[PDB]
């Protein structure tokens, strides 16, 4: 699809057998989902933004579907207000910026 | 252009006569630049992101040039880790997400 930026570019994702809304975020290296009980091994991570850092759990090799497009990779899970689709997965779905 | 996301979508901007590098950030409602001097009146404001809320200076109707494209809009200055072009200006240069 083509998503304009008048509004926050929110999409539906499928992850860990759940449907969810997430932000397509060219400003994010990584993918950060709101607290959820993913099964799987994980390691602790700190990630930064505007106001400091939060601790998240890193899960590797996690299959995910973004608006019908399948991908698989690292997902961080922590106390983010918004589901964030970062570049690691945006490249997998063929997403670009165009102007 | 078309811009892929294997690397951070970083661009040169011209603001206030000065060149800087900035990240094209579809996950930001607003444009927030590192500490710098800008001419005009500014209002104190707060914004938030991952890691919490920061204090910023708000400049309205600032012209900025982004990869040769002209915008004039609100620009925020403060302790952001990176110069960030948000949707307020990305809409002005006709930026979309495509996949």
């Amino acid at each position: 699809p083509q998503i304009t930026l008048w509004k926050r570019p929110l999409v539906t994702i499928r992850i860990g057998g759940q449907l969810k809304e997430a932000l397509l975020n060219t400003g994010a290296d990584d993918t950060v989902l709101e607290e959820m009980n993913l099964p799987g091994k994980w390691k602790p991570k700190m990630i930064g933004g505007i106001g400091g850092f939060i601790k998240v759990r890193q899960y590797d090799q996690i299959p995910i579907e973004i608006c019908g497009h399948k991908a698989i990779g690292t997902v961080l899970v922590g106390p983010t207000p918004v589901n964030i689709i970062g570049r690691n997965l945006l490249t997998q779905i063929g997403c670009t910026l165009n102007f | 252009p078309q811009i892929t996301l294997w690397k951070r979508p970083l661009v040169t901007i011209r603001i206030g006569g000065q060149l800087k590098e900035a990240l094209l950030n579809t996950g930001a409602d607003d444009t927030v630049l590192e500490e710098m001097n800008l001419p005009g009146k500014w209002k104190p404001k707060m914004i938030g992101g991952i890691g919490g809320f920061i204090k910023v200076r708000q400049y309205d109707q600032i012209p900025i040039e982004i990869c040769g494209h002209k915008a004039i809009g609100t620009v925020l200055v403060g302790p952001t880790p990176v110069n960030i072009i948000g949707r307020n200006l990305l809409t002005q240069i006709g930026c979309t997400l495509n996949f």
């Binding site: 975020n25 400003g27 930064g48 207000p81 964030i84 | 991952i50």
Partner: peptide, 8 residues
């Protein structure tokens, strides 16, 4: 407003 720069 809200600004979701993520540094990984």
């Amino acid at each position: 407003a809200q600004t979701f720069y993520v540094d990984g």
